[model samples]
Target: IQPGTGYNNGYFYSYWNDGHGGVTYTNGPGGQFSVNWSNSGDFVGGKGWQPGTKNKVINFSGSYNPNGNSYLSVYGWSRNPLIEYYIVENFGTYNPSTGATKLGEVTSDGSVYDIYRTQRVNQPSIIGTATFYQYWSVRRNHRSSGSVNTANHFNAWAQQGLTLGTMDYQIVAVEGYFSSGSASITVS
Candidate 1:
């Protein structure tokens, strides 16, 4: 499908809602913009993305309203060597004063991917306090299948300005205490 006015593309990777009249960017037709998906459809085994000469914005914020549901959407780039996608959230970050921060991919391989992203946060009617960010998590399912091939691939693609509070690390060992995993996190 195509995207709307506020958004330029629909590469939805991760998403969340705070439950206080959440904002959702109902996926629009024009929102779809995979270089391969745009150039060709699924029938032809389309091509993937490559490193761009122009600086692509991995993160963007806007209001996404489709089918009567609206959301404060933040679109950005990330990958897990498996799936290419963007991140979107509702009801917290897209306020008037503080604009959203955007992150883009910068790899030569032509892929934007994230592995496992799951968040169940509940924010009520308040803005500016709810903070959400994602680092390159390992593909949970890929790791779950017990395949040693794609495993051990740490380090996010093209990271330069990752912050401390942000999840700027890869989940290296999935067998840590406190329901946690070890990672060689980027120095934020």
Candidate 2:
């Protein structure tokens, strides 16, 4: 448990440093977590909360086993600092935005995404202050279980105009780049 902050049992763990793992969050069978690593760097095991106001229809359910390069997402942050995500899973290299710009394909809630956009300059706001310019919307496959209607996927990317900025912090994670072995994710 080390990256940004951590707190077992009660729920509250965050990370985005990338590499060197060993994060566990065990409590009954409701909210479980495990992210063990060996060191190849690029790890993120977040679990933030508080996202009230909106169409609100967030359901959770996950299970992972990518002992290599991975990804399991549902990050959120809006307030002109939009950085939404919904990448259920992505083993191996875990590339979702190599050169992003493919906005085509939808089906939120039931799972079926293929949207990718990129833009980042100063970038620094998981809880803002100055550094800005970031509006990414990545989601490209590997979903498991569904029912996510966060304001109808922000009104389907604001009807293609894109500007997802409403909900604040809402994360549910599992990411590892150049990862090692062992991985676990249970979001209930």
Candidate 3:
């Protein structure tokens, strides 16, 4: 309904309604969360951590329903090096890699993903406004639920000569840009 960000039930919830839409998030105990969003641009929300780990194997089970376009994934960031990363498990309507640079392909969690890197010049970041790189592992075949061995992607990125900073907020997020969507996410 409105823009909000907070931590609850041991889960960090963020809702950014940048354009002409809205989102609502509910955080449940034991790392479970759900979100519903409506038509908008650059609207994102979900549950995760303010500062995440480098290798936490996560099991995600839920549903992703996007009316137009959405990106569902293990999303987060790193600070010292200022990197934004995503391990896309599912998407709707459009591909998030449309404008990113395809560096290579990586196989993880029983799927093959295309690695991509994008540059954000003087953009908003966790520490402040700065330039950074966005690392992505977009699943070739989208899946709404699965176990993600997150380190695999981290290692894969390293193998590709990408360096990860210390660590930043990480979450299993459902992102929608100029679209509409809703999701039910339960993670442990």
Best by TM-score: 3
Which lDDT tens digits does candidate 2 get at residues 1-188? Answer: 44565555555556665334443323233456666665556666655465533565655565566666766666656666455454443445656566866666667655666655566655555654345433334555555445566665556656666665566656567777765655555553
Q: After best superposition, candidate 3 residue 48: deviation in angstroms?
A: 2.3
Residues 16-131, candidate 1: write the lDDT tens digits. Answer: 22222212222323323111111111110001122211133322212222221111212222322222222222222122112323333322222232423322144211122333
lDDT of 2: 0.56
Rate residue 47 of model 1 by lDDT. 10
Q: In candidate 2, what residue range of length 10 has the lowest lDDT sum?
A: 19-28
In order, the Cα lDDT scores of the candidates are 0.22, 0.56, 0.81
CA deviation > 4 Å runs, candidate 3: 1-4
Worst 10 residues of 3 by lDDT: 16-25
TM-score for candidate 2 = 0.30
In angstroms, give how far residue 14 of model 3 lies from its true place.
2.9
What TM-score does each of the candidates earn? 0.20, 0.30, 0.91
Q: What TM-score should be assigned to candidate 3?
A: 0.91
Judge candidate 2 at residue 60 and give its lDDT: 55
Worst 10 residues of 1 by lDDT: 38-47
Candidate 1 to native Cα RMSD, angstroms: 18.3
